[PDB]
Scaffold this motif. Sequence first.
Motif, PDB file in Angstrom:
ATOM      1  N   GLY A 153      62.937  -4.439 -20.435  1.00 34.23           N
ATOM      2  CA  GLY A 153      63.299  -2.899 -21.202  1.00 34.23           C
ATOM      3  C   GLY A 153      63.296  -1.696 -19.866  1.00 34.23           C
ATOM      4  O   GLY A 153      62.216  -2.533 -18.583  1.00 34.23           O
ATOM      5  N   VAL A 154      63.338  -1.011 -19.859  1.00 32.91           N
ATOM      6  CA  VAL A 154      63.040   0.431 -19.013  1.00 32.91           C
ATOM      7  C   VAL A 154      62.496   1.941 -19.322  1.00 32.91           C
ATOM      8  O   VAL A 154      62.686   1.975 -21.120  1.00 32.91           O
ATOM      9  CB  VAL A 154      64.441   1.306 -18.784  1.00 32.91           C
ATOM     10  CG1 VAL A 154      64.523   2.222 -18.175  1.00 32.91           C
ATOM     11  CG2 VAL A 154      65.687  -0.680 -17.920  1.00 32.91           C
ATOM     12  N   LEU A 155      61.659   2.159 -18.799  1.00 28.87           N
ATOM     13  CA  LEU A 155      60.300   3.214 -19.057  1.00 28.87           C
ATOM     14  C   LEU A 155      61.346   4.775 -18.794  1.00 28.87           C
ATOM     15  O   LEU A 155      61.207   4.558 -17.676  1.00 28.87           O
ATOM     16  CB  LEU A 155      59.897   3.046 -18.573  1.00 28.87           C
ATOM     17  CG  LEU A 155      57.922   4.011 -19.303  1.00 28.87           C
ATOM     18  CD1 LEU A 155      56.876   3.959 -19.307  1.00 28.87           C
ATOM     19  CD2 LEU A 155      58.039   5.144 -19.790  1.00 28.87           C
ATOM     20  N   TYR A 211      62.159   2.164 -23.167  1.00 24.78           N
ATOM     21  CA  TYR A 211      60.689   2.904 -23.640  1.00 24.78           C
ATOM     22  C   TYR A 211      60.618   4.131 -23.121  1.00 24.78           C
ATOM     23  O   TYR A 211      61.905   4.739 -22.684  1.00 24.78           O
ATOM     24  CB  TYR A 211      59.879   2.200 -22.985  1.00 24.78           C
ATOM     25  CG  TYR A 211      59.767   1.088 -23.273  1.00 24.78           C
ATOM     26  CD1 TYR A 211      60.388  -0.263 -22.463  1.00 24.78           C
ATOM     27  CD2 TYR A 211      57.865  -0.098 -24.437  1.00 24.78           C
ATOM     28  CE1 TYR A 211      59.889  -1.156 -22.755  1.00 24.78           C
ATOM     29  CE2 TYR A 211      58.129  -0.770 -24.347  1.00 24.78           C
ATOM     30  CZ  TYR A 211      58.614  -1.502 -23.143  1.00 24.78           C
ATOM     31  OH  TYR A 211      59.212  -3.135 -23.554  1.00 24.78           O
ATOM     32  N   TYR A 212      60.225   5.314 -24.391  1.00 26.90           N
ATOM     33  CA  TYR A 212      59.489   6.812 -24.181  1.00 26.90           C
ATOM     34  C   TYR A 212      58.840   6.944 -24.562  1.00 26.90           C
ATOM     35  O   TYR A 212      57.921   6.705 -25.451  1.00 26.90           O
ATOM     36  CB  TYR A 212      61.160   7.169 -25.364  1.00 26.90           C
ATOM     37  CG  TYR A 212      62.831   6.961 -25.332  1.00 26.90           C
ATOM     38  CD1 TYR A 212      63.687   7.041 -24.299  1.00 26.90           C
ATOM     39  CD2 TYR A 212      63.019   6.010 -26.427  1.00 26.90           C
ATOM     40  CE1 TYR A 212      64.878   6.598 -24.394  1.00 26.90           C
ATOM     41  CE2 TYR A 212      64.492   5.423 -26.026  1.00 26.90           C
ATOM     42  CZ  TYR A 212      65.309   5.904 -25.208  1.00 26.90           C
ATOM     43  OH  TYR A 212      65.948   5.499 -25.233  1.00 26.90           O
ATOM     44  N   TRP A 213      58.111   8.387 -24.165  1.00 29.26           N
ATOM     45  CA  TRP A 213      57.628   9.057 -23.779  1.00 29.26           C
ATOM     46  C   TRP A 213      57.714  10.522 -24.707  1.00 29.26           C
ATOM     47  O   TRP A 213      59.131  10.898 -24.020  1.00 29.26           O
ATOM     48  CB  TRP A 213      56.750   8.630 -22.867  1.00 29.26           C
ATOM     49  CG  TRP A 213      57.679   9.599 -21.626  1.00 29.26           C
ATOM     50  CD1 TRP A 213      58.104   9.145 -20.462  1.00 29.26           C
ATOM     51  CD2 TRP A 213      56.292  10.899 -20.639  1.00 29.26           C
ATOM     52  NE1 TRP A 213      58.654   9.714 -19.665  1.00 29.26           N
ATOM     53  CE2 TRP A 213      57.475  10.718 -19.344  1.00 29.26           C
ATOM     54  CE3 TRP A 213      55.958  11.493 -21.232  1.00 29.26           C
ATOM     55  CZ2 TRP A 213      57.433  12.194 -18.700  1.00 29.26           C
ATOM     56  CZ3 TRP A 213      55.563  12.839 -20.884  1.00 29.26           C
ATOM     57  CH2 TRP A 213      56.602  13.298 -18.956  1.00 29.26           C
ATOM     58  N   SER A 214      56.407  11.508 -24.516  1.00 33.45           N
ATOM     59  CA  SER A 214      57.154  12.802 -24.553  1.00 33.45           C
ATOM     60  C   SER A 214      55.437  13.167 -24.858  1.00 33.45           C
ATOM     61  O   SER A 214      54.729  12.352 -25.119  1.00 33.45           O
ATOM     62  CB  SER A 214      57.636  13.139 -26.004  1.00 33.45           C
ATOM     63  OG  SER A 214      58.037  14.878 -26.085  1.00 33.45           O
ATOM     64  N   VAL A 215      55.448  14.770 -24.843  1.00 35.15           N
ATOM     65  CA  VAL A 215      53.863  14.946 -25.154  1.00 35.15           C
ATOM     66  C   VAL A 215      54.115  16.299 -26.686  1.00 35.15           C
ATOM     67  O   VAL A 215      55.288  16.968 -26.322  1.00 35.15           O
ATOM     68  CB  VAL A 215      53.700  15.444 -23.852  1.00 35.15           C
ATOM     69  CG1 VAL A 215      52.076  16.737 -24.033  1.00 35.15           C
ATOM     70  CG2 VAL A 215      53.301  14.855 -23.413  1.00 35.15           C
ATOM     71  N   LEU A 216      53.411  15.987 -26.920  1.00 37.77           N
ATOM     72  CA  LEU A 216      52.962  16.730 -28.708  1.00 37.77           C
ATOM     73  C   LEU A 216      52.328  18.454 -28.352  1.00 37.77           C
ATOM     74  O   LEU A 216      50.510  17.522 -28.702  1.00 37.77           O
ATOM     75  CB  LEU A 216      53.260  16.060 -29.760  1.00 37.77           C
ATOM     76  CG  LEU A 216      52.931  17.003 -31.463  1.00 37.77           C
ATOM     77  CD1 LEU A 216      54.284  17.543 -31.782  1.00 37.77           C
ATOM     78  CD2 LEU A 216      52.431  15.977 -32.237  1.00 37.77           C
ATOM     79  N   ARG A 217      52.383  18.952 -27.902  1.00 43.28           N
ATOM     80  CA  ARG A 217      51.474  20.201 -27.361  1.00 43.28           C
ATOM     81  C   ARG A 217      50.749  20.977 -29.116  1.00 43.28           C
ATOM     82  O   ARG A 217      51.181  20.678 -30.251  1.00 43.28           O
ATOM     83  CB  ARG A 217      52.364  21.363 -26.509  1.00 43.28           C
ATOM     84  CG  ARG A 217      54.096  21.889 -26.893  1.00 43.28           C
ATOM     85  CD  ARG A 217      54.870  22.074 -26.031  1.00 43.28           C
ATOM     86  NE  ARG A 217      55.931  22.623 -26.190  1.00 43.28           N
ATOM     87  CZ  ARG A 217      56.985  22.807 -24.944  1.00 43.28           C
ATOM     88  NH1 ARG A 217      56.126  23.295 -24.573  1.00 43.28           N
ATOM     89  NH2 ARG A 217      58.389  22.368 -25.142  1.00 43.28           N
ATOM     90  N   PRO A 218      49.960  21.426 -28.892  1.00 46.33           N
ATOM     91  CA  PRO A 218      49.018  21.959 -29.706  1.00 46.33           C
ATOM     92  C   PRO A 218      49.612  22.927 -30.577  1.00 46.33           C
ATOM     93  O   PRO A 218      50.526  24.099 -30.386  1.00 46.33           O
ATOM     94  CB  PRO A 218      47.827  22.947 -29.177  1.00 46.33           C
ATOM     95  CG  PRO A 218      47.481  22.012 -27.133  1.00 46.33           C
ATOM     96  CD  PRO A 218      49.430  21.407 -27.096  1.00 46.33           C
TER      97      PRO A 218
END
Lengths: 159, 159, 159, 325, 325, 325
Positions: free
Chosen positions: D93-95, D230-237
């Motif tokens: 798959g693809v990131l 595939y997915y990524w993200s950043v949950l900020r404070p």
Amino acid sequence: GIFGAIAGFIEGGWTGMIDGWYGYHHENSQGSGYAADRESTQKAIDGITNKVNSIINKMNTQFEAVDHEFSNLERRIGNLNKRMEDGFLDVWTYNAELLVLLENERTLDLHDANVKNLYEKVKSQLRDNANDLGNGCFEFWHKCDNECMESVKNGTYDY
Amino acid sequence: GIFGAIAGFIEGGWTGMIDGWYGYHHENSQGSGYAADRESTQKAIDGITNKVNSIINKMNTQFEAVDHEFSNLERRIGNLNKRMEDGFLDVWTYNAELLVLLENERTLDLHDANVKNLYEKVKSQLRDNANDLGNGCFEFWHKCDNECMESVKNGTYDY
Amino acid sequence: GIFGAIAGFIEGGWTGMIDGWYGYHHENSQGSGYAADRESTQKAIDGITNKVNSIINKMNTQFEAVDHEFSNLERRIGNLNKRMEDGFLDVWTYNAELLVLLENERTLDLHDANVKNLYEKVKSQLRDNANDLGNGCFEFWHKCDNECMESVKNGTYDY
Amino acid sequence: DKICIGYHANNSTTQVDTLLEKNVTVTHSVELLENQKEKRFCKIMNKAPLDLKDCTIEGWILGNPKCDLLLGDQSWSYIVERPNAQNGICYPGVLNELEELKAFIGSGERVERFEMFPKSTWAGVDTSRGVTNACPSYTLDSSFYRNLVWLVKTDSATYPVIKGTYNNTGTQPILYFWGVHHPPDTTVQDNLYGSGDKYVRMGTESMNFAKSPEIAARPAVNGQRSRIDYYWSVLRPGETLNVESNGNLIAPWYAYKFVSTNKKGAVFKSDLPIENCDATCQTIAGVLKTNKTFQNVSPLWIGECPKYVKSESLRLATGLRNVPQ
Amino acid sequence: DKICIGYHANNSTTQVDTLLEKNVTVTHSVELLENQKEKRFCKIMNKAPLDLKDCTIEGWILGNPKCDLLLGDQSWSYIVERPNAQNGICYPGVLNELEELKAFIGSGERVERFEMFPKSTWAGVDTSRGVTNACPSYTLDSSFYRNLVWLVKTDSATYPVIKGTYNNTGTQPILYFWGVHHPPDTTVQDNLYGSGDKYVRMGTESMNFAKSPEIAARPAVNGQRSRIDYYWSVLRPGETLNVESNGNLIAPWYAYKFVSTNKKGAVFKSDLPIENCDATCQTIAGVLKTNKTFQNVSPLWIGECPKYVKSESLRLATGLRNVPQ
Amino acid sequence: DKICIGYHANNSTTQVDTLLEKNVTVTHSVELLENQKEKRFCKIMNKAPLDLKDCTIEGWILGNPKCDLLLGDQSWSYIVERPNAQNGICYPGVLNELEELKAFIGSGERVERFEMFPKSTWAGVDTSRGVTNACPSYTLDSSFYRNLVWLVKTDSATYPVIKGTYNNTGTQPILYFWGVHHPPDTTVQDNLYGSGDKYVRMGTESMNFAKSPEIAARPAVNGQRSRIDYYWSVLRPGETLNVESNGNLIAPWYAYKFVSTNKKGAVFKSDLPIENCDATCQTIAGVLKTNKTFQNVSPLWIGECPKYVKSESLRLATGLRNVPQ
Ligand SMILES: *[C@@H]1O[C@H](CO)[C@@H](O)[C@H](O)[C@H]1NC(C)=O
Ligand SMILES: *[C@@H]1O[C@H](CO)[C@@H](O)[C@H](O)[C@H]1NC(C)=O
Ligand SMILES: *[C@@H]1O[C@H](CO)[C@@H](O)[C@H](O)[C@H]1NC(C)=O
Ligand SMILES: *[C@@H]1O[C@H](CO)[C@@H](O)[C@H](O)[C@H]1NC(C)=O
Ligand SMILES: *[C@@H]1O[C@H](CO)[C@@H](O)[C@H](O)[C@H]1NC(C)=O
Ligand SMILES: *[C@@H]1O[C@H](CO)[C@@H](O)[C@H](O)[C@H]1NC(C)=O
Ligand SMILES: *[C@@H]1O[C@H](CO)[C@@H](O)[C@H](O)[C@H]1NC(C)=O
């Protein structure tokens, strides 16, 4: 030289003179010796130390390339980054190589000039108390002890 | 100086001469006085005006930074833009600072040379009438009235 | 000139000397004519050939603009590419134009120095056999055939 | 009796070049360029780099079963990824946004792994059978990523809407991952997730995400005809993440609390060894120990290095022309 | 009787630097760099900038109700956005290709607000009850963007396919906006748009757009767990736009005829005051009034400015070394 | 008797400029900049460029019927696309990732056209009557792209699932194209493909694709209110492509085996003629025949050219100042 001194009418240099850049070789019959003119030599030293230091600090920035990667559909921005990085690499290369070449020249002409000026500073404190062979050597008619030799180089020669 | 004139055998400068950059101080039986060499002073002025104008116009382009913004997923192209802008800022800063330093040097050596050449052009119009103190002053042969004085500045008084 | 020779105390140069950059014009018993000091002249040739070759070789890189197109939603990176390409174009234009101007001066100053140095290496063995008119010309008191006349250029004049 | 004026000379054979003449020997001169390299990777500000061994950045950060060596907390001054890393994305798959992800992680200094969504989060589904022979460990031939869980409907009923929340009450941004499973045909889709149109949807204060399966017949990769996006993200404070899906979710399980560095940051792809050294200047080609102004070793570096330049030497004359006899 | 040869001196205190020496007093010299700034914003080409006050570019151009002071036509030489303007996107969501939008508007000179799709365009739907407490004006606590309309099914029937056409017969490109509403759950979706699969579709000669709702529960932002995907586009002169939807459309209402200004266009984020002055050179840090060649004030500017440089001084010697006695 | 010291002079009138003085005549000098151009396109490495004539890159590479002269195998040193080339995308729609495609073809040197999917691949459908007056080979006729086929249900039954495979067992990657047809209403959709949910699906080792039609009324372009979403991709050596669809597929028919160059390729937008000449340096503005270091013709070039600069002259003094008498 363009001032004609170094590799000019004074066509060679003294292995014997070891604590300076410019200086003297007197010979009286108290004896002989080499001695360097430490205040023109210290002026050249200071000036050139300053030049080197100036160049070094004007060169204290770095263009920073990056590890950044680019997908198959980012060929254009990938190539943009490459052309940018290569671009700056080229100009700094040019700047460094060119500067060195120019300044080296000017450094040599500076030394050449300095020698010439020293020769000139002696010829007219001494001018018919002396003759001039023209090789940059000086010919006195009188008697020259070494407080007389020190006369000339101290700059207090009594005409 | 590398030509040995300014702050050399001519060990100081004349506040009294307010008429130009290079010149004379005669002394006769009508009086004394300062007067500047209008043709060496004007060539130097012309040359240096040209240098400054040349420099000004070669620096008459600007790299243009932009207000453009970049999202969280545009960190790479954002950083590319920053590195580019900082890059050109760096090379132009270098270029300006280096050029200034180099040219200031050369400008001073130019003035020095100008003085030296005037000293020798007077020196080689009269050399055994009067003879050189080493000063860059000459005590004369003769009584030199005052177009006996500018006689010399004329470049035409015949010996 | 800064060494005062070219267009100075030597107020012109010789159409007749088609033989090089620096040289001589004799006049005696046998006749007169032009002949150039070629080991000073093409030491200058080698040196200046050198400068030019160095410049060409330091300018021996190319920044590469590209054909790339950008969509309506790629306005920022499109303008980024524009500002980058124009940016590098500006500095290379600056560097080139500036270099030419700087080097041209220095080149003329070099020739100026070369002429002056030739003048002084002649005068320094012609001590009192000749009269220096200040013209860049020497008047003999004794007289000079042509094995005399090359003995002067030859560096072989013993007296 | 009598006195002469002259200048210095010596046994020096070191030459320089000028605009008018090349190869001119001088009494004293200085070299501004360093061309000498220690071909190794050493510490920066006394802090060791991170060797990914035979794992790529993807395999590491997704928790590829064969990358358990890197699992847990890590701190680094920079990262070294090896040219021949075999263990990356094991399930084909693809990131998405791979390069931005790398750039972001490179901007990092430390990560603390933690459980963000226990399997208990996902109600009315099977969380224990998400394994494949495409992702073996060195202990079972069929496994899966340590930071992800492949949800499958219960072996009985259909696939219910499932929900998950994480409120980031912490002081550090959180790097996390998830995915969407893409079967090769309609029947795999139905064996795994049941009938009906399915969706994977995610939302925070500053991010919303929604995707459906894109079921198509594909060639086998590692014996698998399916793919995973595939997915990524950043949950900020301060932010909070809501997860909602009725099928095809590759759910986030473990994630990383992230410490970005104001700084530099580097990711070196290289074969050089990491030794127990220290350094103030570390390039992709090796370590520099110099007081010099220029260098021609590498344009890519971490720490404080001389300006990179293509010249082989930049020697500056300080002394006079040398004329001994 | 005698004659002397010499050179000029004076009361000059000005020093310069060279390669060989620092701090050298000289008779005459010139300063090439300007470091002096008027800390304010002035007219450029005798045309005033646009102050957005307590509005961001988003809030202004979408017609945030609290940005009504800015409503209608605008002309500017540049734009001034204040560092923490409060009024932007009031109803939570993402403005797509935001950074391109800002750059596009920055390249602008003037906008003419006009009605592109009257509420009458949308037949069989309710166009008057699309308001929210997330978007208050200064008169009603519940309003909505002035350039957008939130369509909802009628006090009556379900949500029919609705259609709209605009033929740009003008000579100017049109900047316009629309959106897709994403409810947090299914019952909200059906209350607003009725049941059934919904779509928003838009087409021009050079652009097509089609998207569906993404129903999921998100964290509350301004009291809404719902989101809006905001979109913008540019209808070129000659082009024509078709709009078709059976639900969840945030329809374009008012748009802007746009005048690109060919030149450098600028948007300054700054708190400096705008006064009734003129200028030929305006930086983000203030106005420059000089004939000088360099400056170290700011790299960001509009108008004709000196080359920005990091130097503190660039003083060039014209006169000779000063040796008074 | 007497002897003189002096210097050279001649009839030279050529001047240079310096920092201190402009317009200085000298005995000998050299010009470093070339400003002379042959306004034409010539061969590079004795290999001819590719004239696209009245075709854009799109029209060429999709096989626009009006571009048949360009059809088949091509070899080029660079590409010349003409500013007012009329023949590109004839059937209205958007080619996805257009600019990356152009950059990619630009990085190329040769293509071999071949049949990838014979029409026989698609069973139980009509492969011959997918033609339109929007894509004439002349003006009144009805045709379609040579590299694509517009599949339609056969005149009666429904549109069966159709399948196609290509295993790229060769050593060269394959550039190919496909599309999704978007009818303007439901009645057109059913006349062409019948009722039911429709999909276009494509899968390789490294690529997944699945999309459905987005039926909406658009402005007429070349008489079509329909649209086609065009897609392109590269089937790498070893990879295999599965194609599966039950409607709205614009199938790949012919494709290109592609030879990358290793780089420095060019695409020139220009009106200049291509004549039967050769060159070592070819700019967008013309050919350079020179030994010089600089040029002010163009920054855009193929081959080995002098450094581009905007200077009008760069003349370097070699001889001395000219003082004739
Ligand atoms: C000087 O020139 C003469 C020409 O008569 C030649 O014979 C002689 O070798 C030369 N001497 C030197 C030292 O160059
Ligand atoms: C300078 O010296 C090196 C060796 O010391 C030699 O190889 C080179 O060719 C010389 N330079 C030139 C221009 O001949
Ligand atoms: C130059 O002079 C300034 C006086 O304004 C002084 O502050 C500075 O330290 C001096 N620097 C050097 C290197 O002499
Ligand atoms: C997250 O928790 C804090 C208190 O711990 C609360 O104030 C905030 O509203 C919560 N956010 C959500 C989306 O529940
Ligand atoms: C230099 O000479 C040209 C003649 O071609 C003349 O047009 C120009 O004005 C001169 N430059 C200056 C600065 O006077
Ligand atoms: C392609 O063909 C080769 C043999 O020619 C075979 O090994 C490979 O498995 C084939 N791939 C597919 C997807 O059929
Ligand atoms: C737009 O209006 C022009 C006349 O002004 C007309 O010719 C054209 O057909 C119209 N376009 C559409 C899509 O209706």
